[PDB]
Structure 1
Amino acid sequence: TEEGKLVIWINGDKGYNGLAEVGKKFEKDTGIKVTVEHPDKLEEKFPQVAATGDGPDIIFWAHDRFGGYAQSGLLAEITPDKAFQDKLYPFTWDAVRYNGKLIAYPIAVEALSLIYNKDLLPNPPKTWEEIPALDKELKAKGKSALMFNLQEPYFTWPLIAADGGYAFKYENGKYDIKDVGVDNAGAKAGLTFLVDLIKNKHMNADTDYSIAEAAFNKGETAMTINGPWAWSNIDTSKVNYGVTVLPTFKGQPSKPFVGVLSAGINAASPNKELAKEFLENYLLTDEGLEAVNKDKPLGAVALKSYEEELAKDPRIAATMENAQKGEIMPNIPQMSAFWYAVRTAVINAASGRQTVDAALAAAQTNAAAVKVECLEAELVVTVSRDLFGTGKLVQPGDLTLGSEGCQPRVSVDTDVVRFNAQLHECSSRVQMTKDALVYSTFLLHDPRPVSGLSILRTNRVEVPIECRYPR
């Protein structure tokens, strides 16, 4: 990558100019230059480049991605002394722990909250069920009740999880990677409510992060749903806003996934010592975290000393209230499959392209059995041969990707079938969102002709396979 310097990747919604200021100070004292970059899809790009021995020295992301990276051998083990570990909260260290090793430095606790315009709405609704009626009133005076990012499942998940949706079942000291709670009655109820909001034109299916942000920050919508990072732009807009508890659904609290912003060190980095110095002695200090937080708020920082200093903030208090009512994300490798599954399900259900029941049923299978990798002109689909959980392995001839024109290369291992497919010939459907070009197809399992009576538990499965590329 290059010795004698530090390249850092952090997401574009985070305080990367502030992190760059911390890097400027590092360079002053040490002479080592620090380059902070915020590439798009960095959570997907990191493992691709790190596997070739390249990529940045340090990668920032929520903790949920790091178990996959660790499992893939992409991360150096971090070795802080007890004195440094004492400075941060135990819960945050827990988040960056994988298979008995610490695999990242924890930075800050994140959770979504309800953000609301006090002038347009002095009393924000305590329940989701209120919102359609509240929207009607606001529509009368040229406004909307609620706008938030409907393109990323992170933002819709709190509602889905409220009445009993979950990611993976934690049982007997581990997560069961085949027990996915995206297709239970609680999850269906949550998504159905969301899809109804769109049906009844209280929300729009195409609404994304930037649209929702512009709407609230211009005073066009009374509420939005976002994290601490979002506050800086609202402050600049001079909108009179409050950060509060997310609305309940069917009397139960919204359950946002708690994320811990984490910093991992590339296993291929020749600057592992410099990276440790930077993170421990420059970033993870009151002065370091202040520089980043000033840029874009981090939330509840992992560093005890600075967290206590900011805890008075009622916005942070609300973040932690919502964090309390939600669940911490697993960091297991299967989380990206889970996120793909839910992202796709919500988009297809919200568009009316698929039903809520059918969408979430497919999401279960995708999360449990499927991995989608989108490359330049190419697509890789890896399917678990234990497709149902029976222990009975599917045969590759019974699996089909796309239509007859789609002629992928098919490879078989003991446990998986792998499709290497050209996107042009295998795209059943293509479409454009504001931000993306979307290529879509389907994976089918159909063991026809089957040799008996078909009793139950249909062996016919079909799941959406989809790739999204930035416009």
Structure 2
Amino acid sequence: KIEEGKLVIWINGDKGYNGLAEVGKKFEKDTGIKVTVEHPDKLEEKFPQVAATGDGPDIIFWHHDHFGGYAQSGLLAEITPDKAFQDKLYPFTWDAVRYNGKLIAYPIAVMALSLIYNKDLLPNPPKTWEEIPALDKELKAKGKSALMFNLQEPEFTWPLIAADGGYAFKYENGKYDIKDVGVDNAGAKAGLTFLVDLIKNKHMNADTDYSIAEAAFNKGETAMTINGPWAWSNIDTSKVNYGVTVLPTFKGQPSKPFVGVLSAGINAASPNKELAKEFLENYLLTDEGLEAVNKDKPLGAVALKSYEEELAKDPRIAATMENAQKGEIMPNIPQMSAFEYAVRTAVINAASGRQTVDEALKDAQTRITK
């Protein structure tokens, strides 16, 4: 019970649904087809309900992690870019939109955490995790701290923990292995330890949450923090002089951030697959298209090479991409819930004393692979 003759698009209201609308006006002028951009409440939960009955929008915008499940249900259509088109985007973004060996979405935006710092308290940021401890002691002498970041959730703590070799699920030939998890190997143990030790020595507090960390860094009390593109505006208003850069290395290896990709999938029920493909590939994924959305509401870093080289003139953005090329693509499978649940607890119990690192990671590991 879907259109045929137009295009309805569901995008979250905190995104540039206006420039998306603008790009629509050009499509309409060139094709004569009208585009509609809507923002239903809690759309991530409605698409699944409505698409299961052959209804909903022709295109849905969202993080790629939810896309694996959608495909396990045959809700999306297998896109069809050719060799040439595929060479317009970064090789690693296509892996983020794969399933059982096949492509199912178009990478739009690329997100990943970064290290943020107060240029007035820290003229040059640390290239290593190993040196932070000594840096905090040097600042505490003046009534400041070195680092403060959300410690409640895996998104913020996984980068360190996995640098040495840990991981979510083994992957190599286009298929994941839900029985082979790496949160309990040597590397993952090495990283959690380093983190726990930071708290034990009072360089960090275990109850620090997103709000405290942001309030602290924006009042100008802490030299650094870790966060994404979505938090820059608050800082802009606070009157702090900040900078964004590459995350420190661990035991000589890069921090390994989870990589998130805003994607556009075609409803498998949609009678407008061609139009949708023409719109996404030749209107939205162009330097003019991505700019239109980025104006209304900034996107951060993108997957389109040509335009990424232009946005990358803002160090804040160049850093994001570099951190993404070193990170681990977020697995697009429903089992990632088991992972977030288990790891969030492991880190909390390990930071509270309730469990030692070796015990905490043994439980989660077994939990997930269960």
| TM-score relative to the length of structure 2 | 0.81
Aligned equivalents of 1:123, 1:184: Cα separation in 2: 33
Structure ranking higher on relative contact order (CA contacts 8 Å, 6+ apart): 2
1:460 matched residue in structure 2: none
> Cα distance, 1:180 vs. partner?
0.5
Distance in 1 between the 2:154 and 2:282 partners?
35
RMSD (Å), alpha carbons? 4.3
Q: Is the 8 A contact 1:231 1:296 kept in 2?
A: no
**SS in structure 2 of the partner of residue 264 of structure 1:** strand
| Kept after mapping to 2: 8 A contact 1:163/1:250 | yes
Query: Structure 1 residue 362: deviation in Å?
Result: 2.3
1:105 deviates by 0.7
* Alpha-carbon distance in 2 for matches of 1:40, 1:195: 39
Name the SS for the 2:235 alignment partner: helix
Deviation of 1:5 after TM superposition, in Å, equals 6.3
Preserved contact between residue 149 and residue 208 of structure 1 (Cα < 8 Å): yes
Q: Please state how far the C-alpha of 1:289 moved relative to its aligned partner.
A: 1.0
SS of 1:194 mapped into structure 2: helix
User: Distance in 2 between the 1:470 and 1:144 partners?
Assistant: 39
Contact 2:100/2:175 (8 A) holds in 1: no
Q: 1:68-104 CA deviation, whole Å, 9 max, x = no partner? A: 2211212122234566445434433333222233210
TM-score of the superposed pair, with normalisation by structure 1: 0.66
Query: Cα–Cα, structure 1 residues 168 and 297, in superposed 2: closer, same or farther, change >3 Å?
Result: same
Distance 1:25 1:309, change over 3 A: same
Give the Cα–Cα distance (whole angstroms) in 1 for the partners of residues 73 and 344 of structure 2: 24
Greater shift, 294-303 or 20-29, is seen at: 20-29
Partners of 1:198 and 1:350 within 8 A in 2: yes
SS in 1 for 2:181: strand
Deviations 1:37-76 (A, max 9, x none): 6778765665455445555543333333322221121212
1:263 and 1:92 map into 2 onto residues whose CA distance is 13
Aligned to 2:117: 116
> Taking structure 1 as reference, are residues 191 and 90 closer, same or farther at Cα in structure 2, changes over 3 Å only?
closer
Q: Aligned residue for 1:228?
A: 229
Give the distance between the partners of 1:164 and 1:328, measured in 2 at CA.
14
Distance 1:353 1:93, change over 3 A: same
Q: Determine if contact 1:15/1:229 at 8 Å carries over to the other structure.
A: no
Instruction: Using the aligned pairs only, state the percent identity.
Output: 97
Contact 1:64 1:259 in 2 (8 A): yes
Distance change (3 Å), C-alpha of 1:17 and 1:152: farther
Query: Within 1, Cα distance between the matches of 2:316 and 2:150?
Result: 20
Any residues of structure 2 matched to 1:14-413 within 5 Å, and which?
15-16=16-17, 18-19=19-20, 21-23=22-24, 46-47=47-48, 50-51=51-52, 53=54, 56-80=57-81, 84-170=85-171, 174-269=175-270, 272-273=273-274, 275-294=276-295, 297-365=298-366
Q: Is the 8 A contact 2:179 2:369 kept in 1?
A: no
Computing the radius of gyration over CA atoms, which structure comes out larger, 1 or 2? Answer: 1
- Is contact 1:229-1:296 (8 Å) kept? no
How far 1:135 moved relative to its partner?
A: 2.8
Distance change (3 Å), C-alpha of 1:54 and 1:185: farther
Closer, same or farther in 2 for the Cα pair 1:118/1:338, shift >3 Å? same
CA distance in 2, matches of 1:335, 1:342: 10
Secondary structure in structure 2 of the residue aligned to 1:167: coil
Structure 1, 207-216 or 285-294: larger mean CA deviation: 207-216
Per-residue deviation, 1:333: 4.6
* Cα separation, 2, equivalents of 1:16 and 1:29: 20
- DSSP-derived class of the 2:192 partner: helix
Whether the 8 Å contact between 2:162 and 2:255 is mirrored in structure 1 is yes
By percentage of residues, which structure has more helix?
2
The 3 A distance-change label for structure 1 pair 64 and 354 is same
Question: Residues 42, 114 of structure 1: CA spacing in aligned structure 2 closer, same or farther, 3 A cutoff?
Answer: farther
**Structure 1 unaligned blocks of 5 or more:** 366-467
Deviations 1:301-324 (A, max 9, x none): 222321222233333332333233
User: What is the alpha-carbon distance in structure 2 between the residues aligned to residue 340 and residue 239 of structure 1?
Assistant: 35
Q: Which runs of 5+ in 2 are unaligned?
A: none
Q: Cα offset for 1:246? A: 0.8
Distance across 2 between alignment mates of 1:93 and 1:105: 8
- Going from structure 1 to structure 2, the CA distance change for 1:253 and 1:175 (only over 3 Å counts) comes to same
CA distance in 2, matches of 1:233, 1:16: 21
CA contact (8 A) 2:8 2:38 kept: yes
Say if 1:102 and 1:169 are closer, same or farther in 2 by CA, change over 3 A.
closer
Please give the alpha-carbon distance, in whole angstroms, between the structure 1 residues aligned to 2:62 and 2:192: 27
1:111, 1:319 within 8 Å by CA — same for their partners in 2?
yes
Q: Whole-Å Cα distance in 1 between the matches of residues 202 and 10 of structure 2?
A: 38
Distance 1:87 1:313 in 2: 21
Change in 2 beyond 3 A, CA 1:208/1:280: farther
**Cα pair 2:144 2:223 within 8 Å, conserved:** yes
Q: Supply the distance in 2 between the matched residues of 1:470 and 1:288 (Cα, whole angstroms).
A: 42
Q: Secondary structure at the match of 1:181?
A: coil
Alpha carbons of 1:359 and 1:55: their partners in 2 closer, same or farther (altered >3 Å)? farther
Rounded Cα–Cα distance in structure 2 between residues aligned with 1:227 and 1:112? 5
In structure 1, how many angstroms separate the alpha carbons of the residues matched to 2:260 and 2:171? 17
Q: Which moved more, 1:290-299 or 1:20-29?
A: 20-29
Contact 1:7 1:37 in 2 (8 A): yes
CA distance in 2, matches of 1:201, 1:39: 45
| Distance in 2 between residues matched to 1:358 and 1:72, nearest whole Å | 36
Residue 11 of structure 1 deviates from its aligned partner by: 5.5
Please identify, of 71-80 and 86-95, the stretch whose mean Cα deviation from structure 2 is larger. Answer: 86-95
